[PDB]
């Protein structure tokens, strides 16, 4: 996952 996770 690239963002948030």
């Amino acid at each position: 996952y690239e963002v948030h996770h």
Partner: antibody
Framework: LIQLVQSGPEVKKPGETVKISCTAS????????IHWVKQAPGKGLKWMGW????????TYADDFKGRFAFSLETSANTAYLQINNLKNEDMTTYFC???????????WGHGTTLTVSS | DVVMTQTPLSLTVSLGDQASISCRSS???????????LHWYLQKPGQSPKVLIY???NRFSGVPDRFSGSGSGTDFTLKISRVEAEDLGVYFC?????????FGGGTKLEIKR
């Protein structure tokens, strides 16, 4: 072939509880985040939140913190949406979606329609 | 929430012609990592939405090359070249730069016959 399949149409009275399922096949369930998306009025889309399939930790959009609960049965590759104390405004279609690693939704459930009526 | 505004609400395109849909965000969609997490979905009548374009311009596997996305900051465009009948339905822009994730109101593509 990857598929998200949802449980069939639901018909509830106001104030009742419903629990909708989202079953994933064709990949390692615990490696992807599952989201819930509501069909907004005028056939718009509204993000409800996600659940981490590895930790079971849910994140709700503000409007879904009160009456909505995400849960897992990871051994059944299944995510659940539970709605308590059903309201008229809950009456719509609910989608589950898998989040791709570049943070878009790659696979969607076909949807579950919820009727709220006396 | 980041508000996603689509224009037009509806467009009518002849087979083989080009459709252009605009999406404007209430905040920059440029993430701290320098990418914009702006995606396009098509929802056909009675179906779930399906991704066409992710991160502004990336085509999802099996999406024809006549779908192209562009833009930066707050202003994004989906272009559908060589429109085909099965293109009809509701196009949504969506952002996942920010939580909550948000959707545009949709643009209905109508085929001219």
């Amino acid at each position: 072939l990857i598929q998200l399949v949802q449980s069939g149409p639901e018909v509830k009275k106001p104030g009742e509880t419903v629990k909708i399922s989202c079953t994933a096949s064709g990949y390692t369930f615990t490696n992807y985040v599952i989201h819930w998306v509501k069909q907004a009025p005028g056939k718009g889309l509204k993000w409800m939140g996600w659940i981490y399939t590895d930790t079971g930790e849910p994140t709700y959009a503000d409007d879904f913190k009160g009456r909505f609960a995400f849960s897992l049965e990871t051994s059944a590759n299944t995510a659940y949406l539970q709605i308590n104390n059903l309201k008229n405004e809950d009456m719509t279609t609910y989608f589950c979606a898998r989040e791709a690693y570049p943070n878009y939704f790659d696979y969607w459930g076909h949807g579950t329609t919820l009727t709220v009526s006396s | 929430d980041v508000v996603m505004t689509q224009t037009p609400l509806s467009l009518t395109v002849s087979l083989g012609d080009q459709a252009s849909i605009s999406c404007r965000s209430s905040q920059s969609l440029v993430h701290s990592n320098g990418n914009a997490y702006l995606h396009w979905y098509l929802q056909k009548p009675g179906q779930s939405p399906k991704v066409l374009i992710y991160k502004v311009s990336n085509r999802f596997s099996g999406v024809p090359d006549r779908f192209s996305g562009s833009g930066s900051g707050t202003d994004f465009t989906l272009k559908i070249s060589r429109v085909e009948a099965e293109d009809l339905g509701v196009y949504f822009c969506s952002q996942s730069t920010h939580v909550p994730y948000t959707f545009g109101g949709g643009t209905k593509l109508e085929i001219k016959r």
